Write a protein that binds this ligand. Sequence first.
Ligand code: FDS
Ligand code: FDS
Length: 277
Amino acid sequence: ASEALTMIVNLLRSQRPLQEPTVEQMRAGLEAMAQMSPLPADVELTTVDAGGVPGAWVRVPESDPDRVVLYLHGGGYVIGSIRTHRDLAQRIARAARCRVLLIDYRLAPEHPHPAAVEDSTRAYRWLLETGSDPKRMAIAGDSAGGGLTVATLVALRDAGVPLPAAAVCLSPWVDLEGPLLRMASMYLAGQDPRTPLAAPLYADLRGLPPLLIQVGTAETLLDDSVRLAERARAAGVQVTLEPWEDMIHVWQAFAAMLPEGQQAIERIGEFLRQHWQ
Ligand SMILES: O=C(O)c1ccccc1C1c2ccc(O)cc2Oc2cc(O)ccc21
Ligand SMILES: O=C(O)c1ccccc1C1c2ccc(O)cc2Oc2cc(O)ccc21
């Protein structure tokens, strides 16, 4: 609805994806677009070994150090890094007044399912080991990271690990079968595309903590979020589904230039601070 949206949409077209790019071109591409994004000078970054998963603490002046979001970046389980999602991480840290742990979870096709879930559960387990309180923790992720957020909560529940206070899905990708089909292939490596921890639309969602789903009405993954909300609510999960009118896929990533992007992130901050008390 804002004019900034039309400017974002034109920019995404202007980066014409005509030739089908290799995985390496896609990684280097996304890594370059992210280095052009300025990181505010009050953002403190600390690299860490999160129990055998490489990670980075994102901290800002107003971060409460006892509140933690484990943030799982999207990129079709193929693309993305601790560098590509630092701006989203630093904005969630401000709005939610918390530390964010970004993790460099193993990517396909080099490391197929269930490697991503093994890394996300391990990093969560490591936060507990090192003194983080589940009632002051959340898991959040965008697109593939949004599906991995759900897969992680299921895998943790099934292993008897204490679940966090809340979770946040930004335009989650939870149905691997329906561009993203090829990234689905690379993640699955022959496995059934309704594998519960790969496609958590088929997972048992009972006992998950309060779940915020932010999705745009102008995105092909609208139905993933709607079906997720239905399955979660049928399983007795406290779901908040926010469909944002006319918003595109992970519009929150454009928060620097899109008022709806910064508004969505302030809402993420509110949801988290509400469930932390
Ligand atoms: O969607 C993608 O796979 C992709 C591919 C190349 C560059 C950037 C992206 C996007 C992207 C990658 C990772 C991620 O976690 C989120 C993400 O979000 C978007 C959103 C867009 O509207 C527009 C594009 C992307
Ligand atoms: O959330 C948990 O800590 C958890 C994790 C795995 C299995 C069961 C639980 C729950 C749980 C564990 C111990 C306990 O003393 C209370 C408890 O309560 C709940 C309540 C839920 O809504 C949903 C889940 C749990």
